[PDB]
Amino acid sequence: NYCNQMMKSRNLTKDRCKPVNTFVHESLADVQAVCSQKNVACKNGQTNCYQSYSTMSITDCRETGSSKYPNCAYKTTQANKHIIVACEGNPYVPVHFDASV
């Protein structure tokens, strides 16, 4: 399971099971460019969010109903969609993953 392997390798489920996480299959530079595209509001109402002009390759990792510490288990779902990142700093880069439409 790609999700079970990647959540672990990346230190997300080494000490706990995280319910959901999204992985983006694009170059780092292309995702950082989003912070300069379509400005939109973030869920929390803040407006330092941006939506990608085009869809990107991503896979959603979602914990199943029968997942519990030590043995976290995920359902893997590949898709192409517009990402939304919240941005911050200088260089203005992504600090959070707010969504994917």
């Binding site: 230190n11 997300l12 999204t22 992985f23 299959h25 694009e26 911050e88 993953f97």
Partner: peptide, 15 residues
């Protein structure tokens, strides 16, 4: 220690 941008890349980038 880990910044917010480095953390974001580690948790979400799989170039």
């Amino acid at each position: 220690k880990e910044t917010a941008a480095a953390k974001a890349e580690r948790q979400h980038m799989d170039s």
